[PDB]
Amino acid sequence: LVRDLPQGFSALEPLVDLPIGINITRFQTLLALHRSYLTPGDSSSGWTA
Amino acid sequence: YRVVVLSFELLHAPATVCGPKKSTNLVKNKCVNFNFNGLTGTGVLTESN
């Protein structure tokens, strides 16, 4: 029942350390397309808007 | 003749492949020179809770 970031404290444990060794300046987020790009539905084809 | 070449990359970079060459059997309760994952020192070892 919290739309935005909740108020509290949760420490972030280490997950993985990766030796890629390149330069990174920009990044993007990848999503999952449940609907169809060919035929877009009027509504509810996606996930609750 | 089956041939395998192993090119080792030694750069100023992370080491992801290392040698388990010998895990010396534990000798505790005698103060010794120890080297644990690169940390070097002298002292005695004991079990801890």
Swiss-Prot record, chain A:
Where are the residues of the annotated region Disordered?
35-49
Impact when changing G41V: In strain: Omicron/XBB.1.5, Omicron/EG.5.1
Consequence of changing G46S: In strain: Omicron/BA.2.75
Query: Sites of glycosylation?
Result: N23
The protein's assembly and partners = Binds to host ACE2. RBD also interacts with the N-linked glycan on 'Asn-90' of ACE2. Cleavage of S generates a polybasic C-terminal sequence on S1 that binds to host Neuropilin-1 (NRP1) and Neuropilin-2 (NRP2) receptors. Interacts with host integrin alpha-5/beta-1 (ITGA5:ITGB1) and with ACE2 in complex with integrin alpha-5/beta-1 (ITGA5:ITGB1). May interact via cytoplasmic c-terminus with M protein. May interact (via N-terminus) with host bilirubin and biliverdin, thereby preventing antibody binding to the SARS-CoV-2 spike NTD via an allosteric mechanism.
Q: What is the purpose of this protein?
A: Attaches the virion to the cell membrane by interacting with host receptor, initiating the infection. The major receptor is host ACE2. When S2/S2' has been cleaved, binding to the receptor triggers direct fusion at the cell membrane. When S2/S2' has not been cleaved, binding to the receptor results in internalization of the virus by endocytosis using host TFRC and GRM2 and leading to fusion of the virion membrane with the host endosomal membrane. Alternatively, may use NRP1/NRP2 and integrin as entry receptors.
What is the name attached to this protein's record?
Spike protein S1
Curated annotation (Swiss-Prot), chain B:
Consequence the record notes for mutating T40K: In strain: Omicron/BA.1
Region: Disordered, residue numbers:
12-34
Q: Quaternary structure per UniProt? A: Binds to host ACE2. RBD also interacts with the N-linked glycan on 'Asn-90' of ACE2. Cleavage of S generates a polybasic C-terminal sequence on S1 that binds to host Neuropilin-1 (NRP1) and Neuropilin-2 (NRP2) receptors. Interacts with host integrin alpha-5/beta-1 (ITGA5:ITGB1) and with ACE2 in complex with integrin alpha-5/beta-1 (ITGA5:ITGB1). May interact via cytoplasmic c-terminus with M protein. May interact (via N-terminus) with host bilirubin and biliverdin, thereby preventing antibody binding to the SARS-CoV-2 spike NTD via an allosteric mechanism.
Q: What does this protein do?
A: Attaches the virion to the cell membrane by interacting with host receptor, initiating the infection. The major receptor is host ACE2. When S2/S2' has been cleaved, binding to the receptor triggers direct fusion at the cell membrane. When S2/S2' has not been cleaved, binding to the receptor results in internalization of the virus by endocytosis using host TFRC and GRM2 and leading to fusion of the virion membrane with the host endosomal membrane. Alternatively, may use NRP1/NRP2 and integrin as entry receptors.
Q: Under what name is this protein listed?
A: Spike protein S1
Which region of the full protein is contained in this chain? 508 to 556 of 1273
